[PDB]
Design a protein around this ligand. Structure first.
Ligand code: A1EG7
Length: 412
């Protein structure tokens, strides 16, 4: 029994990191690409947005029909397609072609997320799902940190083409391995399935009218959209306007991801500690106080980065701002998942998470072409100023709505 749970969870952890590294490989190798194939700021945006659009369509549709699909096949198939797209991209040299391959990568990526959830419920008792989900989430943060550094070093003699085209062969091999290892159900290998686990079931039309659902959703679009702006365009702001080199720009990229690793873990640990001292009720959520502090740090940290950082600034001051931003950015994302689960009606628990995910990727879309267009017209600094203002305004609005009703659905 135990031997099987370790092999599976490790395997899913391994697979998830590779989907992500491959989703972002484009951002990792962007400075080099621009130098070899010269491109305008706007062109870069179109390629980034195209992936975000596909992912959103795929992730919403997939979840709805996932109850009809097998996890072992779905995870493996998705990985193979992502890998093949990466190989082709390196060979290709023109922008219209690059964008279409990126859309295809986005759609394949969608296939991966629903299976992970199904195995987790099936092999682990419902009580522990929360802990496992968070450990699994850390896979992304590890991959994201390792990659930028690897690129700024591997590009010493190798081409951008050959450093993206191994991230395809490795994907194919690991897809085969994960097809071999993952098992859909405990009954498949001979072990007994886990023991299976009618009070005012709200109708779907009553869910969409809940005031707290939108405050929790639009508050997730702003945080996620801002995190994508600094993840993709933060490197060119230092390279072009701040007079920094490419190595320093990629060093800031890794320190951003490392900060979130200690941020997601601390957010879960700190949240329930405060929850046990007050308790839960219909009006308000005790984790609001912790969420406001993390959001406050995010807007303050970005303000110092735009103004204080310059060519004279030492390397240490650049990294510390990135690390603090990573802690303050990834922290709300972990809390938003927990808050949605408890507030959601028991009968519509699954649909509530899907709705939040839909508006999640819309924020990523706005961080692509619309953000790049503002930067090209005036400057990179002008575009980042707009992102700072939007984040600050959201915190004040969410502050005033801290005492609204949270339990979605008709409450007697
Ligand atoms: O599904 C969940 C969270 C469940 C959860 C948490 C704590 C628990 O204790 C628990 O029992 C259950 O969150 C969703 C995760 C999301 O799909 C992702 O990042 O991949 C984005 C968005 O869709 C979120 O809503």
């Amino acid at each position: 029994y135990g031997y099987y749970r370790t092999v599976i969870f490790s395997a899913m952890f391994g697979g998830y990191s590779l989907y992500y590294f491959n989703r972002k490989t484009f951002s990792f190798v962007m400075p080099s690409l621009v130098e070899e194939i010269p491109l305008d700021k706007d062109d870069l945006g179109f390629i980034t947005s195209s992936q975000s659009a596909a992912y959103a369509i795929s992730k919403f549709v997939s979840g709805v029909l996932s109850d009809q699909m097998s996890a072992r096949w779905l995870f493996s198939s998705g990985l193979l397609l992502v890998g093949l797209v990466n190989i082709f991209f390196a060979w290709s040299s023109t922008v219209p072609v690059f964008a279409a391959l990126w859309f295809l990568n986005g759609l394949a990526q969608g296939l991966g997320w629903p299976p992970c959830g199904k195995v987790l419920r099936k092999w682990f008792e419902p009580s522990q799902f929360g802990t496992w989900w968070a450990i699994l989430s850390t896979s992304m943060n590890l991959a994201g940190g390792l990659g930028p550094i690897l690129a700024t070093i591997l590009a010493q003699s190798y081409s951008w083409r050959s450093t993206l085209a191994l991230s395809g062969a490795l994907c194919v091999v690991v897809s085969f391995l994960c097809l071999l290892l993952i098992h859909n159900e405990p009954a498949d290998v001979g072990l007994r399935n886990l023991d299976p686990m009618l009070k005012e079931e709200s109708t779907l039309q009553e869910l969409l009218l809940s005031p707290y659902l939108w405050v929790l959703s639009t508050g997730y679009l702003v945080v996620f959209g801002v995190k994508t702006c600094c993840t993709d365009w933060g490197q060119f702001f230092l390279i072009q306007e701040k007079g920094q080199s490419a190595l320093v720009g990629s060093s800031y990229m890794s320190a951003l991801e490392v900060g979130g690793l200690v941020g997601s873990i601390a957010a879960g640990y700190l949240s329930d500690r405060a929850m046990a001292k007050a308790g839960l009720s219909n009006y308000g959520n005790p984790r609001h106080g912790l969420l406001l502090f993390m959001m406050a740090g995010m807007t303050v940290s970005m303000y110092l980065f735009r103004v204080t950082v310059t060519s004279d600034s030492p390397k240490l001051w650049i990294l510390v701002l990135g690390a603090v931003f990573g802690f303050s950015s990834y922290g709300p994302i972990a809390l938003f998942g927990v808050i949605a689960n408890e507030s959601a009606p028991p009968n519509l628990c699954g649909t509530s998470h899907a709705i939040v995910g839909l508006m999640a990727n819309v924020g990523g879309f706005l961080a692509g072409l619309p953000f790049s267009t503002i930067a090209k017209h005036y400057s990179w600094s002008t575009a980042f100023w707009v992102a700072e203002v939007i984040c600050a305004a959201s915190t004040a609005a969410f502050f005033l709505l801290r005492n609204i009703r949270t339990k979605m659905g008709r409450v007697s």
